[PDB]
């Protein structure tokens, strides 16, 4: 049982060569003070005289003093040892991946506006800013800026949309007379070096590394980037032989290197400063620069609803040197083409990192030639379809040809509590409300403290720690959950069904209550006409049945609604649950079936013959109590906390007391 | 010599109609003295306070 051995593994998790470690200084001295003792010069000397030892004690002190220095720049020395970030990039960027300044906040538009020229083709050209207010604060907008120039057909009727995408900043180009000696250095805070763009003299030239990189373009146009240990970005090119060497393609030969400069080639660059990481979800907008006989009619959010969404994106802290350290490493493995499905991760992890708390990359074996990836929009967990296809695209660059890139979101476990915190009124002059703005970060502290690191198992009580560490005048703090799943199909269980991974009691399984069309027809004066009647139902679980299964009962049915077959009966038991309705309608019937130590849920309403459309909505959201403590996780199910989007999941009750 | 003191219940409406104002300590009243209004005598919440 557990783990039996043979001399097994090695040196701990991680090397440490250790006759480096620190050690206290009386154990220092206690090493060395032995040192001196035995030398052959003098066995005479007694050391614990005190005379000797303060001065003995004096040569630990500079040789302690010293050491941390020898000792230190071995972590430094060493990645994954680096305790300095700006030493873990530098190995990093060394290994070919580096960590980024924070990335704009980025989104698209699509803008209906009429010219007022009527000409066949504006375009937007690449630079005009627009404003967006943060979230719910109107104080200040956000401006972000046209990422590139676009252009529109001009609609008959004359009213055109063109559509473009917005990354958030202002445009800052900058050009510099290249020369010989002399860094090139952008000083500016606030840069990305992913919106960094360039012009030479003319043409421009792409750090290989993560724009294109694959084009007929020969690789003598490149640069590099590098971070001043300052906190500034530095530029960098390749300087003779620029591309890989020789005669290459050219029949003449000799050498370029390129940029002589002399004057040669004056160097402009354009790029954006950014705001962001506060600017993630930006709804309202302002079309905030003018042209020529341009008038934006009107700016409507978001083309392609997810339909969940939120306004822009990215910024970034940027900084991390936890998912940072390990990470180049896979780089540092892997070639820039990205093949290992890790690979895939780690790559997916560079560009978006700041997208992306979390991605899952795998393989579904059903679908071969699909890379499928489970990534975390990290402000959301759906990323907005055009991400989606973004990335997709930008990562379809790095890929096997016949491999197609595939992203879903995954299903998602959601985790609805109700929480019962107590606090004294007195101990606390701090305004109460507040406090509930404390608690509600610190929430999601424990989360993104473990839960979407590895989604592993689930402890609700640990994440309840935090919570009741949060203000320390909380005198108490309870809460209950509810395990919750969404569906996609009300109509009919997915294949497989589901399952919770999660021993959850029975009876205890639940879903949400939803109106239905009934043919049957309902008038009132004034109303005339109406259709018909409309009420609701809702998915229950029916009791434990021995073997631990149980079949699913629908929701309350009148009279006349479902046609009786013979086949199908009202289920008509006695356990099943049952919503209190105006109706008192007690058909029930079995839609389908389920059993609990499985965890596996199944049903179809092609069982019923209820029609599809008869019901109103598409999705509903699914209701569980794990009867176990902890909530396990498996494959692409995870528990996550996202209250903003989903506040309903989320619940907290605040208990004052004196 | 001893603050003249007293205690006062006082009804008020929050603007704001949260669930609990303190008053904190150090709120100053006027008072006159016995029939005259001259001055009033000025006089300062004793301490934090909600309701």
Redesign the interface.
């Known amino acids: 049982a557990n783990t039996p051995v043979n001399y097994q593994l090695t040196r701990t998790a991680n090397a440490i060569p250790e006759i480096f470690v620190g050690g206290t200084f009386a154990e220092i001295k206690q090493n060395l003070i032995e040192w001196l003792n035995g030398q052959n010069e003098f066995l005479d000397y007694d050391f614990e005289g005190s005379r000797l030892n303060v001065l003995c004690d004096l040569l630990a002190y500079n040789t302690l003093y010293i050491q941390q220095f020898g000792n230190a720049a071995v972590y430094e020395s060493f990645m994954r040892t680096a305790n300095l970030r700006s030493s873990v990039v530098q190995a990093a960027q060394d290994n070919g991946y580096l960590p980024t300044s924070k990335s704009a906040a980025q989104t698209e538009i699509m803008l209906t506006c009429t010219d007022a020229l009527n000409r066949n083709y504006i375009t937007i050209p690449r630079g005009t800013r627009f404003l967006a207010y943060a979230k719910d604060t109107s104080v200040n907008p956000y401006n972000f800026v046209s990422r590139e120039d676009v252009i529109a057909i001009r609609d008959k009727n004359n009213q055109y949309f063109p559509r473009l995408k917005l990354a958030q900043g202002r445009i800052v180009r900058t050009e510099i007379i290249y020369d010989k000696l002399t860094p090139i250095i952008i000083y500016d805070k606030n840069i990305d070096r992913n919106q960094v763009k360039l012009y030479v003299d003319g043409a421009e030239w792409i750090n290989w590394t993560r724009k294109s990189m694959v084009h007929a373009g020969s690789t003598s146009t490149i640069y590099y980037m590098r971070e001043t240990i300052d906190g500034n970005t530095e530029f960098y090119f390749g300087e003779g032989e620029i591309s890989v060497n020789a005669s290459e393609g050219a029949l003449t030969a000799n050498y370029i290197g390129g940029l002589k400069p002399t004057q040669n080639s004056t160097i402009v660059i354009e790029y954006i400063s950014t705001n962001g990481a506060d600017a993630n979800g930006a709804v309202g907008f302002s079309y905030a620069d003018t042209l020529t006989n341009i008038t934006v009619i009107n700016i409507n959010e978001n083309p392609n609803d997810d339909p969940d969404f939120v306004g822009a994106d990215g910024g970034g802290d940027p900084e991390d040197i936890e998912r940072i350290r390990e990470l180049g490493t896979i780089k540092r493995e892997t070639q820039q083409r990205c093949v290992t499905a890790t690979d895939y991760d780690t790559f997916v992890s560079e560009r978006f990192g700041s997208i992306i708390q979390a991605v899952q990359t795998f393989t579904d074996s059903t679908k071969p030639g699909y890379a499928f990836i489970a990534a975390k929009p990290k402000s959301g967990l759906y990323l907005t379809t055009v991400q989606r296809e973004d990335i997709k695209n930008y990562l379809k660059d790095y890929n096997l040809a016949p491999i197609t890139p595939s992203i879903i979101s995954p299903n998602y476990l959601f985790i609805k509590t109700n929480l019962k915190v107590t606090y004294a009124?007195n101990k606390l002059?701090e305004?109460?409300?507040w406090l509930e703005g404390q608690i509600i970060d610190k929430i999601d502290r424990y989360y993104t403290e473990d839960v979407e690191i590895f989604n592993s198992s689930f402890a609700k009580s640990k994440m309840l720690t935090y919570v009741d560490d949060a203000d320390h005048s909380v005198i108490g703090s309870s809460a209950t959950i509810q395990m919750v799943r969404e569906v996609q199909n009300f109509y009919k269980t997915p294949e497989a069904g589901i399952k919770y991974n999660n021993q959850i009691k029975d009876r205890s399984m639940e879903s949400n209550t939803f109106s239905f069309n009934s043919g049957r027809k309902v008038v009132n004066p004034d109303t005339g006409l109406e259709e018909d009647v409309l009420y609701d139902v809702r998915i229950v679980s029916t009791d434990r049945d021995s073997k631990g299964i149980g079949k699913v009962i629908i929701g309350p049915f009148a009279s006349g609604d479902v046609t009786e077959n013979e086949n199908i009966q009202p289920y008509t038991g006695n356990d099943f649950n049952k919503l209190a309705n105006s109706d008192g309608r007690d058909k029930y019937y079995v839609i389908g079936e389920i059993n609990y130590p499985a965890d596996v849920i199944y049903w179809n309403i092609a069982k019923i013959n209820l029609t599809s459309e008869k019901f109103e909505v598409q999705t509903i959201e699914l209701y569980s109590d794990p009867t176990d403590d902890v909530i396990f996780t498996r494959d692409g199910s995870l528990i996550v906390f996202e209250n903003d989007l989903r506040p309903q999941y989320l619940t907290i009750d605040l208990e004052?007391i004196s």
């Open positions: 009124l002059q305004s109460e409300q004052p």
